[PDB]
Amino acid sequence: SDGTWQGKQYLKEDGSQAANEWVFDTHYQSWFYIKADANYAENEWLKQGDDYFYLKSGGYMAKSEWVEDKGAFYYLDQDGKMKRNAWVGTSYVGATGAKVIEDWVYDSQYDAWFYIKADGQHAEKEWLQIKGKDYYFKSGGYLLTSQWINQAYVNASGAKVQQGWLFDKQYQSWFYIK
Ligand SMILES: C[N+](C)(C)CCO
Ligand SMILES: C[N+](C)(C)CCO
Ligand SMILES: C[N+](C)(C)CCO
Ligand SMILES: C[N+](C)(C)CCO
Ligand SMILES: C[N+](C)(C)CCO
Ligand SMILES: C[N+](C)(C)CCO
Ligand SMILES: [Zn+2]
Ligand SMILES: [Zn+2]
Protein backbone atom coordinates (compact mmCIF):
# COMPACT_ATOMS: atom_id res chain seq x y z
CA SER A 1 0.00 0.00 0.00
CA ASP A 2 1.16 3.60 -0.61
CA GLY A 3 -0.98 4.76 2.38
CA THR A 4 1.15 6.42 5.12
CA TRP A 5 0.74 7.62 8.73
CA GLN A 6 1.96 11.22 9.35
CA GLY A 7 1.62 11.48 13.17
CA LYS A 8 -2.04 10.62 13.99
CA GLN A 9 -3.14 11.32 10.39
CA TYR A 10 -3.42 8.90 7.47
CA LEU A 11 -2.77 9.71 3.81
CA LYS A 12 -4.69 7.27 1.53
CA GLU A 13 -3.17 5.46 -1.54
CA ASP A 14 -4.25 8.37 -3.82
CA GLY A 15 -2.54 10.89 -1.43
CA SER A 16 -5.91 12.29 -0.08
CA GLN A 17 -6.18 12.95 3.70
CA ALA A 18 -8.52 10.41 5.39
CA ALA A 19 -11.21 11.90 7.72
CA ASN A 20 -14.55 10.67 9.16
CA GLU A 21 -13.93 7.21 7.74
CA TRP A 22 -12.63 3.76 8.45
CA VAL A 23 -9.28 2.87 6.82
CA PHE A 24 -7.77 -0.59 6.59
CA ASP A 25 -3.98 -0.29 6.62
CA THR A 26 -2.44 -3.45 5.09
CA HIS A 27 0.86 -2.41 6.73
CA TYR A 28 -0.71 -3.20 10.15
CA GLN A 29 -3.51 -5.53 8.69
CA SER A 30 -5.80 -3.49 10.93
CA TRP A 31 -8.87 -1.28 10.64
CA PHE A 32 -8.57 2.26 12.09
CA TYR A 33 -11.19 4.97 12.40
CA ILE A 34 -10.17 8.44 11.31
CA LYS A 35 -12.20 11.18 13.02
CA ALA A 36 -13.51 14.42 11.45
CA ASP A 37 -10.26 16.18 12.61
CA ALA A 38 -8.23 13.65 10.47
CA ASN A 39 -6.77 12.03 13.68
CA TYR A 40 -7.24 8.24 14.35
CA ALA A 41 -9.67 7.41 17.19
CA GLU A 42 -7.67 5.94 20.17
CA ASN A 43 -8.89 4.40 23.53
CA GLU A 44 -12.51 5.19 22.68
CA TRP A 45 -15.85 3.78 21.56
CA LEU A 46 -17.38 4.45 18.16
CA LYS A 47 -21.13 4.12 17.64
CA GLN A 48 -22.13 3.28 14.04
CA GLY A 49 -25.86 2.61 13.72
CA ASP A 50 -26.81 0.12 16.49
CA ASP A 51 -23.20 -1.24 16.51
CA TYR A 52 -20.31 -0.33 18.84
CA PHE A 53 -16.57 -0.56 18.02
CA TYR A 54 -13.63 0.02 20.27
CA LEU A 55 -10.42 1.69 19.12
CA LYS A 56 -7.49 0.65 21.27
CA SER A 57 -4.26 2.47 22.08
CA GLY A 58 -2.51 3.24 18.74
CA GLY A 59 -6.02 3.23 17.08
CA TYR A 60 -6.22 -0.53 16.26
CA MET A 61 -9.81 -1.69 16.08
CA ALA A 62 -10.47 -4.28 18.88
CA LYS A 63 -11.62 -7.60 17.39
CA SER A 64 -12.23 -11.11 18.86
CA GLU A 65 -11.15 -9.71 22.21
CA TRP A 66 -12.16 -8.58 25.66
CA VAL A 67 -11.76 -4.92 26.59
CA GLU A 68 -12.10 -3.45 30.10
CA ASP A 69 -13.81 -0.01 30.27
CA LYS A 70 -14.87 1.65 33.60
CA GLY A 71 -14.51 -1.69 35.42
CA ALA A 72 -16.77 -3.58 32.91
CA PHE A 73 -15.65 -6.18 30.36
CA TYR A 74 -16.86 -5.94 26.71
CA TYR A 75 -16.33 -8.47 23.91
CA LEU A 76 -15.67 -7.31 20.30
CA ASP A 77 -16.47 -10.00 17.65
CA GLN A 78 -14.30 -10.94 14.55
CA ASP A 79 -15.64 -7.78 12.71
CA GLY A 80 -14.98 -5.44 15.67
CA LYS A 81 -18.71 -5.24 16.64
CA MET A 82 -19.47 -5.29 20.38
CA LYS A 83 -21.45 -8.47 21.29
CA ARG A 84 -24.76 -7.97 23.19
CA ASN A 85 -27.18 -10.53 24.82
CA ALA A 86 -24.94 -13.61 24.32
CA TRP A 87 -22.68 -16.17 25.92
CA VAL A 88 -19.04 -15.44 25.11
CA GLY A 89 -17.44 -18.62 26.47
CA THR A 90 -18.57 -18.91 30.13
CA SER A 91 -19.38 -15.14 30.33
CA TYR A 92 -22.70 -13.53 29.42
CA VAL A 93 -22.75 -10.03 27.93
CA GLY A 94 -25.98 -8.10 28.55
CA ALA A 95 -27.94 -5.38 26.76
CA THR A 96 -25.15 -2.73 26.98
CA GLY A 97 -22.44 -5.27 26.00
CA ALA A 98 -21.08 -5.32 29.61
CA LYS A 99 -20.30 -8.78 31.01
CA VAL A 100 -23.14 -9.53 33.49
CA ILE A 101 -22.11 -10.04 37.10
CA GLU A 102 -24.23 -10.49 40.23
CA ASP A 103 -27.49 -10.64 38.29
CA TRP A 104 -30.15 -12.77 36.68
CA VAL A 105 -29.98 -13.63 32.98
CA TYR A 106 -32.97 -14.95 31.05
CA ASP A 107 -31.72 -16.68 27.91
CA SER A 108 -34.56 -17.40 25.41
CA GLN A 109 -32.39 -20.03 23.61
CA TYR A 110 -32.34 -22.25 26.73
CA ASP A 111 -35.72 -20.86 27.97
CA ALA A 112 -34.06 -20.72 31.40
CA TRP A 113 -32.88 -18.26 34.03
CA PHE A 114 -29.24 -18.17 35.11
CA TYR A 115 -27.53 -16.22 37.87
CA ILE A 116 -24.03 -14.84 37.42
CA LYS A 117 -22.37 -14.59 40.82
CA ALA A 118 -20.44 -11.38 41.64
CA ASP A 119 -17.30 -13.45 40.71
CA GLY A 120 -18.53 -13.53 37.02
CA GLN A 121 -19.28 -17.32 36.99
CA HIS A 122 -22.83 -18.71 36.49
CA ALA A 123 -24.29 -20.52 39.52
CA GLU A 124 -24.12 -24.29 38.83
CA LYS A 125 -25.36 -27.41 40.68
CA GLU A 126 -25.79 -25.43 43.85
CA TRP A 127 -27.95 -23.39 46.20
CA LEU A 128 -27.41 -19.66 46.40
CA GLN A 129 -29.10 -16.99 48.55
CA ILE A 130 -29.96 -14.05 46.27
CA LYS A 131 -31.54 -11.00 47.93
CA GLY A 132 -32.42 -13.06 51.01
CA LYS A 133 -34.12 -15.95 49.12
CA ASP A 134 -32.86 -19.46 48.27
CA TYR A 135 -32.50 -20.59 44.62
CA TYR A 136 -31.09 -23.84 43.22
CA PHE A 137 -29.21 -24.03 39.89
CA LYS A 138 -28.85 -27.35 37.99
CA SER A 139 -25.95 -28.58 35.82
CA GLY A 140 -25.52 -26.09 32.95
CA GLY A 141 -26.64 -23.29 35.33
CA TYR A 142 -30.44 -23.57 34.70
CA LEU A 143 -32.55 -22.18 37.62
CA LEU A 144 -34.90 -24.93 38.92
CA THR A 145 -38.56 -23.82 39.13
CA SER A 146 -41.80 -25.40 40.44
CA GLN A 147 -40.30 -28.65 41.85
CA TRP A 148 -39.08 -30.51 44.92
CA ILE A 149 -35.36 -30.43 45.64
CA ASN A 150 -34.75 -32.99 48.41
CA GLN A 151 -37.21 -31.81 51.14
CA ALA A 152 -37.50 -28.21 49.76
CA TYR A 153 -39.99 -26.85 47.20
CA VAL A 154 -38.99 -24.08 44.78
CA ASN A 155 -41.81 -22.07 43.26
CA ALA A 156 -42.32 -20.70 39.71
CA SER A 157 -39.84 -17.82 40.48
CA GLY A 158 -37.35 -20.50 41.66
CA ALA A 159 -37.45 -19.27 45.33
CA LYS A 160 -37.62 -21.93 48.02
CA VAL A 161 -41.13 -21.75 49.61
CA GLN A 162 -40.96 -21.02 53.40
CA GLN A 163 -44.49 -22.16 54.44
CA GLY A 164 -48.00 -22.82 53.15
CA TRP A 165 -50.20 -25.16 51.15
CA LEU A 166 -49.10 -26.65 47.78
CA PHE A 167 -51.25 -28.79 45.47
CA ASP A 168 -48.72 -31.16 43.77
CA LYS A 169 -49.87 -32.13 40.20
CA GLN A 170 -47.23 -34.94 40.02
CA TYR A 171 -48.93 -36.60 43.09
CA GLN A 172 -52.39 -34.89 42.62
CA SER A 173 -52.39 -34.27 46.49
CA TRP A 174 -52.16 -31.33 49.03
CA PHE A 175 -48.89 -30.79 51.00
CA TYR A 176 -48.33 -28.29 53.77
CA ILE A 177 -44.82 -26.82 53.85
CA LYS A 178 -43.51 -25.63 57.31
C1 LIG B 1 -1.88 4.21 13.73
N2 LIG B 1 -0.60 3.66 14.24
C3 LIG B 1 -0.23 4.39 15.50
C4 LIG B 1 -0.78 2.22 14.54
C5 LIG B 1 0.48 3.71 13.18
C6 LIG B 1 1.11 5.05 12.92
O7 LIG B 1 2.02 5.47 13.93
C1 LIG C 1 -14.76 -1.96 10.74
N2 LIG C 1 -15.76 -1.95 9.68
C3 LIG C 1 -17.09 -1.58 10.20
C4 LIG C 1 -15.34 -0.94 8.69
C5 LIG C 1 -15.91 -3.31 9.04
C6 LIG C 1 -16.12 -4.43 10.03
O7 LIG C 1 -14.86 -4.68 10.63
C1 LIG D 1 -20.38 2.60 25.26
N2 LIG D 1 -20.37 1.31 26.03
C3 LIG D 1 -19.77 0.25 25.18
C4 LIG D 1 -19.55 1.49 27.25
C5 LIG D 1 -21.77 0.92 26.45
C6 LIG D 1 -22.67 0.42 25.35
O7 LIG D 1 -23.96 0.08 25.87
C1 LIG E 1 -26.27 -22.57 29.15
N2 LIG E 1 -24.79 -22.36 29.15
C3 LIG E 1 -24.44 -21.51 27.99
C4 LIG E 1 -24.43 -21.61 30.41
C5 LIG E 1 -24.06 -23.70 29.05
C6 LIG E 1 -24.50 -24.59 27.89
O7 LIG E 1 -23.73 -25.79 27.71
C1 LIG F 1 -35.64 -13.49 38.12
N2 LIG F 1 -36.31 -14.63 38.78
C3 LIG F 1 -35.60 -15.86 38.41
C4 LIG F 1 -36.15 -14.48 40.29
C5 LIG F 1 -37.78 -14.70 38.37
C6 LIG F 1 -38.20 -15.99 37.66
O7 LIG F 1 -39.61 -16.09 37.35
C1 LIG G 1 -55.11 -25.79 50.91
N2 LIG G 1 -56.44 -26.22 51.36
C3 LIG G 1 -56.76 -27.52 50.72
C4 LIG G 1 -56.36 -26.48 52.81
C5 LIG G 1 -57.42 -25.10 51.09
C6 LIG G 1 -57.53 -24.58 49.66
O7 LIG G 1 -58.66 -25.11 48.96
ZN1 LIG H 1 2.55 -1.03 1.24
ZN1 LIG I 1 -21.04 -23.19 32.27
Give the residues surrounding ligand 2 with Cβ less than 6 Å away: 22, 31, 61, 79-80
Portions of the chain given CATH number 2.10.270.10: 45-100, 101-178
Cα separation of 110 and 99, whole Å? 19
Q: Identify the CA nearest to 158 among candidates 112, 98, 117, 109.
A: 112
CA angle 176, 177, 178 (to 5 degrees): 115
82 Cβ contact list (under 8 Å, min separation 6): 51, 52, 53, 54, 74, 75, 76, 97
Q: Which residues pair with 31 in a beta bridge?
A: 24
Residue nearest to atom 4 of ligand 1 (CA): 58
What's the DSSP call for residue 101? -
Between CA 73 and CA 67 the distance in angstroms is 6
Written out in words, the top-level CATH class of the domain with range 101-178 is: mainly beta
| Nearest C-alpha neighbor of 52 from the set 84, 30, 99 | 84
The CATH number of the domain covering residues in 45-100: 2.10.270.10
Measured distance CA(152)–CA(134) in Å, rounded: 10
How many other β-carbons are positioned within 10 Å of the β-carbon of residue 18?
19
Ligand closest to the CA atom of residue 110: 4
Interval between CA 118 and ligand 5 midpoint (Å): 17
In degrees, rounded to 5, the angle at the alpha carbon of residue 84 between the alpha carbons of residues 82 and 85 is: 160
| PDB experimental method | X-ray
What is the separation of C-alpha 153 from the centre of its chain, rounded to a whole number of angstroms? 31
- Tell me how far apart the alpha carbons of residues 24 and 20 are, in angstroms, rounded to a whole number: 13
Helices (H) then strands (E): counts for the chain: 0, 18
3-state secondary structure of 61: strand
